[PDB]
Design a protein around this ligand. Structure first.
Ligand SMILES: CC(C)CNC(=O)[C@@H](C[C@H](O)[C@@H]1COCc2cccc(c2)[C@@H](c2ccccc2)NC(=O)c2cc(cc(N(C)S(C)(=O)=O)c2)C(=O)N1)C(C)C
Ligand code: NA
Ligand code: NA
Length: 334
């Protein structure tokens, strides 16, 4: 086709980038994260027990209010690396950036307080491949391609720096040159089915201290930060003189601006983050601790061990996900 469509995103505190979808007739509106690390769409259900406080605090889909709803009812559990939801499958009409698609999605009835009480958004729209879809449900992007309206079988992400201001943007069917400069450089996927590419090395300061034999990088728009395996991150954090707290790593705030660059060697280009890119520079006090936008995440094989490049990375590098050519392109965001 000749359609390019955009989804405007809200940036909450540089950690949560989400947009709006409409489900049902008349539309029921949901805030959702668009997640290349997964392939299922789900929103909280009206059938969720209110003993789940996340369900008291989020928007709930009510099938009883939708004339276009089609019952299915198959049970669905979605295990993410950092949390789990469970519910049942349903079909309805979904509008996303002006495109309307008939979609099977999860109505979530079990929604843990962590992390969901902490989330500004209600649900998740997976932008991965069918290979990673739980219950073999056709992912939304596949459904949209089937309409033959998009100019290209690609989608792109722009995540802005926090703040009038656009929080971010997804382009379905292309890229937006207003939000990048220079040229795209592409890396082939290791294989169709996962948004994951080969990484040649990771250097901290100048020295490929890390990933010396090569490693994997999963480009994850549904993750706020950059992560590596526990052992890689242990090495990385030693180099930074960072202290491991419970869920994150910290540095004295005054030391923040002087931490070294971290570079990611992807397909022949070096992608360099400076300390301003990966430190949440709250104050510059030596009496305060500043959190790093780098975590440990251990993904079991076949997918892992893998690094994940989340919002920290994408904020600096506009990212295009090309399904036609099974590749990811990066360009310098603006
Ligand atoms: C069946 C499989 C195909 C499922 N796929 C997966 O599990 C993939 C992870 C998903 O992208 C998942 C989506 O959450 C989507 C989602 C749902 C709810 C909340 C959030 C993200 C949000 C969050 C957490 C806490 C408070 C506020 C927001 N989380 C985050 O920012 C967040 C989310 C994740 C990881 C981190 N890191 C550890 S990180 C950034 O260092 O790499 C941070 C994650 O598992 N993100 C991995 C394979 C990479
Ligand atoms: Na708490
Ligand atoms: Na927490």
């Amino acid at each position: 086709g000749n359609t390019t469509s955009s989804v405007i995103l809200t940036n909450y505190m540089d950690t949560q980038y989400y947009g709006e979808i409409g489900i049902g007739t008349p539309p029921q509106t949901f805030k959702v994260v668009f997640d290349t690390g997964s392939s299922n769409v789900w929103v909280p259900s009206s059938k969720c027990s209110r003993l789940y406080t996340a369900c008291v605090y989020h928007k709930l889909f009510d099938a009883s209010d939708s004339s276009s709803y089609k019952h299915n009812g198959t049970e669905l559990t979605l295990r993410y690396s950092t949390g789990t939801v469970s519910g049942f499958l349903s079909q309805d009409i979904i509008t996303v950036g002006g495109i309307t698609v008939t979609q099977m999605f999860g109505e979530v009835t079990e929604m843990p307080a962590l992390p969901f009480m902490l989330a500004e958004f209600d649900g998740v729209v997976g932008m991965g491949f069918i290979e990673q879809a739980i219950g073999r449900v056709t992912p939304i992007f596949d459904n949209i391609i089937s309409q033959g309206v998009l100019k290209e079988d690609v989608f792109s992400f722009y995540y802005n720096r926090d703040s009038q201001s656009l929080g971010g943007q997804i382009v379905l069917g292309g890229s937006d040159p207003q939000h990048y400069e220079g040229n795209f450089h592409y890396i082939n996927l290791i294989k169709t089915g996962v948004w994951q590419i080969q990484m040649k090395g990771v250097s901290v300061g100048s020295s490929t201290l890390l990933c010396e034999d090569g490693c994997l990088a999963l480009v994850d728009t549904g993750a706020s930060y950059i992560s590596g395996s526990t052992s890689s991150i242990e090495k990385l954090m030693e180099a930074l003189g960072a202290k491991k707290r419970l869920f994150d790593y910290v540095v004295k705030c005054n030391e923040g601006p002087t931490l070294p660059d971290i570079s990611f060697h992807l397909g022949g280009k070096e992608y360099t983050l400076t300390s301003a890119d990966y430190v949440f520079q709250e104050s510059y006090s030596s009496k305060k601790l500043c959190t790093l936008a780098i975590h440990a995440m251990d993904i079991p094989p076949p997918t892992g061990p893998t690094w994940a490049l989340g919002a920290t990375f994408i904020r600096k590098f506009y990212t295009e996900f090309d399904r036609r050519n099974n590749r990811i392109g990066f360009a310098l965001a603006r």
